[PDB]
Amino acid sequence: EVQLQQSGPELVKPGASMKISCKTSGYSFTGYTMNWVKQSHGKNLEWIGLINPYNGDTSYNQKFKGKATLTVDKSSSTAYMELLSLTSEDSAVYYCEVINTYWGQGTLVTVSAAKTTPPSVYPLAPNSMVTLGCLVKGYFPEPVTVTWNSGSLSSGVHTFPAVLQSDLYTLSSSVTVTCNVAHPASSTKVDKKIVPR
Amino acid sequence: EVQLQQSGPELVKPGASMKISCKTSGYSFTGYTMNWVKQSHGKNLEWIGLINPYNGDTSYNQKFKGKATLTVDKSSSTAYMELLSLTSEDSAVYYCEVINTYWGQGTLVTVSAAKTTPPSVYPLAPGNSMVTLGCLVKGYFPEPVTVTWNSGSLSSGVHTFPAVLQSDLYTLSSSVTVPSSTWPSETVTCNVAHPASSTKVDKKIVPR
Amino acid sequence: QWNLVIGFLFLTWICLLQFAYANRNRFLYIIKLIFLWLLWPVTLACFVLAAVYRINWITGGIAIAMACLVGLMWLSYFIASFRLFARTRSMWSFNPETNILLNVPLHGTILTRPLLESELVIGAVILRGHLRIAGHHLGRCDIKDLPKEITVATSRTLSYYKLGASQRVAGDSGFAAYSRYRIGNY
Amino acid sequence: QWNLVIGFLFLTWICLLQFAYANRNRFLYIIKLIFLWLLWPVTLACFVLAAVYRINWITGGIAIAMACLVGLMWLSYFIASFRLFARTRSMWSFNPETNILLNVPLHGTILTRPLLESELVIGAVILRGHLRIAGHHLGRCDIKDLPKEITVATSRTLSYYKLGASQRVAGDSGFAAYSRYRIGNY
Amino acid sequence: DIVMTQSPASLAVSLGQRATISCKASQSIDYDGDNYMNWYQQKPGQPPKLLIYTTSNLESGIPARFSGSGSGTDFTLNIHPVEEGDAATYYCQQNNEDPYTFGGGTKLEIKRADAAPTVSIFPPSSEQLTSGGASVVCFLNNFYPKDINVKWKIDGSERQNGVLNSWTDQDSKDSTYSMSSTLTLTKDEYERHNSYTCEATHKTSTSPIVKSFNRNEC
Amino acid sequence: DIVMTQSPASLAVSLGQRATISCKASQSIDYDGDNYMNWYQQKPGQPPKLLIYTTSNLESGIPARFSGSGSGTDFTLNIHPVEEGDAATYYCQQNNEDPYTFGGGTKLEIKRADAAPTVSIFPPSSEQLTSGGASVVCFLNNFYPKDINVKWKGVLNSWTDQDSKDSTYSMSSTLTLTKDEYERHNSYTCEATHKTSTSPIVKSFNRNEC
Ligand SMILES: C[C@H]1Cn2ncc(C(=O)Nc3cccc(C#N)c3)c2C(=O)N1c1ccc(C(F)(F)c2ccccc2)cc1
Ligand SMILES: C[C@H]1Cn2ncc(C(=O)Nc3cccc(C#N)c3)c2C(=O)N1c1ccc(C(F)(F)c2ccccc2)cc1
């Protein structure tokens, strides 16, 4: 029943600071050690440190010393790992865990200098089966969620990884109808419909 | 893998005595308690006693005292409950257990002053793609008689009916079901194995 | 007055009360039980010797009541231990600690040890292949444990314990528990 | 000679050595720890005043070597306890029995107890809704207990223990075990 | 002297539904602060099998569909997801005093949809012709419910003397029954009859199922 | 300085066969007389999932198909009845010293009988046409192996991870160009070459198909 909820994806400029939340529920907040882990550049993992929620007692690894400072807020039962003097090498996913068994959800961090341009959504339209497509092009930064018929047609959706090209991501989806696109850090919710041709 | 193996069905004349065995395997003989249970006249159970193999210490109940006596042989790992002054109300099934979980196979005891009559086996022939045929065992004493069908011929679909005591004799009947494509194409045989007479009849069915 | 030898006895008080926990080596446990046993009549004899030599009348004040009480409280416990020995002829019933025994059927032999109290659940820990059930070093074993053990009192109450469930930890360590399932009155 | 008072001292060797362990009553355990702590100062002063009063020369043969030993050991067993207090500030590190602590995160608060030895597997029994992990009565709890506990030494060691598996017995009793999974050096 | 009385004598439960058995103690089987009570399941031709050994604590390897409960002098056993593989008899034991008394027993029957009896008749085998007595056999397989009547008709009329019947136990896969009816008569009576008929009348299907043969069917 | 090296870079096993991963320590992860080693599994888009937490005694709720073993500096993870839902990446961690180092990763792909792609084409839309560009799209679904070739008769390709229900790979290809160059041609063709056949599978369209 133990649950951990993180803050959400954020884009920050280089040389700034950052704070991340790991709000916990389902157990007595004091008692577990709350490790922090970083996964970067694909599928390689690292270790940042741990903090005792009872009485301070933080312990980091020397590589991240002076870069992250773990903090605890007992009243609301939240953990507050924070990064200082960020750099383009710090784009990763940060997890918080307790006993190596209960993990968070991940907080994607994007360190760069560019505007959060809105995506452009386009339809695709053309036997034993019919395949229909949808295209998202020219947005920044990751991620963006593409859904079909608001959670329906979940038996053949094939989303594709976004590929960077001139600082504008692009992806596509196919179903074998409504294409709903949700871009979190641009306040954009575009929906498109496909028509016979 | 704790295993207990009992002696086997026995017929005792009234007024005699009997010794039952509960040979054990799979564990060190000394250490458990080896309860003895009796199931009689259908499906009601009674408790007889227990005995510690390490050193004596038998314990009975106020009803079976003077009737059952339990001993122990540590060399061969067997238990030796013995009944005395057998009467008509002493025919039952006797089990031996250890921790209330591992039980014996059971030992039917028949106390009667009557002869041992071998069974007589007769076939049945049918004189849709489903046809039944069987064999009838008549006039045997005492229980039990194990009836099977060629030791592998249609182990499923066999129906054996419980025997009924008819004037100091027993009658049983077994039936099997075969598809119309195998009879009389193949051969089906039923065999009975009466232990109390040390015989094994084997008669097959011919069509008519 | 005299201060050296009387002070030296206080050093023994730190030898005790700190090393009374000894349950690892069997020899230490046996020697502690023997020391506790042979010390019972020694302390009575000294009290009677102090009582007979009437000095300042204090020998009849508390020195006669003390010996009488320590004798009447020794006779009852000796006869209770004799009853326990009569029930189970185990020779462990004469220990000066408790009157409850635990029988564990190990490989070929049955091991008897004193038990402080009889409870519904009994633990067993096999750290590095060294069995220890009730805080008692029972020897070297593995996860092949006996699924039935016994607890013997003297006032009836022969309790049979059954193996609940055993788990294996870190290759050769483990944990197990025994829960009571049958009671038999003598 | 003098027989009454010295014989009365032999009675204390049965009150101790028989009732001295990790008994369930926490008040008795605290009393025993206090008595053990108060014992050490006495032997130093007693030996000091037994050696300063030079009689029969015995005050120099043994009354100064044993005093020196019992004085030099106290300093080490005090500085170690102060170091353990420096690592974890719990006030339990000053006990004269052991320098290992066990922290159990019960409902809301954390309970600390002395630990004789740090092992790989730690049991727990909840007989009649009364938790007891390492022989220490931790209060009233249920089968729904904590899945992580810690053991704190002073020599740069902090061991984390994870709840292995818990079983229920007879309605409101049960057992559980903890197995070490992480070690952290200070 | 602690005779225990479980008084559902028989009980019928459909698939999926929940069945309960209510063995109750006599006076005071609660010694040492806990109640000791064993529950056993026995199938025809096998020794009893332990399920629950102290009012609780289902034995290792036993499916979790069995639950034991109760206190004082009232105890219950519950099988909530009643499957087709449990058509046994259930017992209760005390495990508290010198006479470890058992319970009476409660036969668990599984309710199912009806079926028609597959009927077969057989003639006297030529081997027993020399014996001097004839036995005609009727088989009724795979029917439900258990109750069913069989009539043996000779030369038009019926016969009710010398007929024997036997039912099997409820199947462990189909929950259906089988029955054998035997009519045995001396050969002198066999001379003076020509037509034999076995009729089976079920609770349903008001028209009976008849199978007949003559003497000259050789 | 306890760098930990599991060096099966990738694995390819069939259904039911044994799967082995052979993470090895650096020098001396054996403190206190016992070896501490955690084994983790991670599927795409999900946090890691613990399986084995001290060289043995797998975590509760995990199927017994996973078994951990080893000693000294050699440790192994075994999955005997390889199912079709085990296509994740597996990691090893020490849990022994001041920094807790992870492994490198070992991507496990499950082998399955051959299959052919289902190519489909999509022409530019008027909405993008008014903006000033065109982008033709080609979709290939449910083929095996991953190594296939696609040709156009300035392209970008994207590959899906192996599916967890039928273990196949999909692919998307996009050709983006200015509309003026789009007006210079009439017929476009997406061809796919796969090892399952001897001739390419061709899907073509023309500007008059509207
Ligand atoms: C509490 C009780 C638990 N208990 N169970 C069993 C026994 C027992 O069999 N004792 C025994 C003693 C000697 C020889 C033999 C033999 N053979 C057996 C005992 C026991 O000794 N107990 C016990 C009583 C009193 C004391 C006292 F130290 F507190 C004490 C001393 C003297 C005067 C008053 C008070 C300390 C311990
Ligand atoms: C074995 C060791 C285990 N041990 N671990 C920790 C401690 C400890 O912190 N002791 C302590 C003592 C006093 C004040 C404080 C504080 N603040 C702390 C101890 C300890 O005391 N030990 C120990 C040594 C000797 C003895 C003796 F009784 F055997 C003894 C007595 C005097 C002369 C010679 C021999 C009994 C026990």
Tab-separated table of C-alpha atoms in Angstrom, chain A residues 28 30-33 35 47 50 54-55 57 98-101, chain D residues 87 89 105-106 108-110 146-148 150 160 162 181-182:
chain	number	residue	atom	x	y	z
A	28	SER	CA	4.338	6.176	8.901
A	30	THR	CA	9.442	8.303	9.769
A	31	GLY	CA	11.307	5.009	9.804
A	32	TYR	CA	12.503	4.327	6.253
A	33	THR	CA	15.753	5.603	4.785
A	35	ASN	CA	17.409	6.447	-1.073
A	47	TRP	CA	23.396	6.601	-6.584
A	50	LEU	CA	20.141	8.742	1.629
A	54	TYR	CA	13.888	11.008	12.044
A	55	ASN	CA	16.970	13.168	12.683
A	57	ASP	CA	21.786	11.949	9.106
A	98	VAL	CA	12.748	3.247	0.533
A	99	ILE	CA	13.661	-0.443	0.914
A	100	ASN	CA	14.746	-1.117	-2.702
A	101	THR	CA	11.202	-2.415	-3.335
D	87	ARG	CA	27.085	8.187	16.741
D	89	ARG	CA	22.192	10.075	20.757
D	105	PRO	CA	10.101	1.855	14.390
D	106	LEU	CA	6.858	1.170	16.240
D	108	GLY	CA	4.817	6.900	15.748
D	109	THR	CA	7.965	6.593	17.864
D	110	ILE	CA	11.184	4.578	17.698
D	146	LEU	CA	7.021	-2.826	10.667
D	147	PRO	CA	8.869	-4.069	7.540
D	148	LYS	CA	12.229	-2.453	8.380
D	150	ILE	CA	17.958	-1.204	12.194
D	160	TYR	CA	19.248	-2.622	7.911
D	162	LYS	CA	13.910	-6.338	6.152
D	181	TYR	CA	20.029	-6.756	3.440
D	182	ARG	CA	22.261	-3.653	3.670
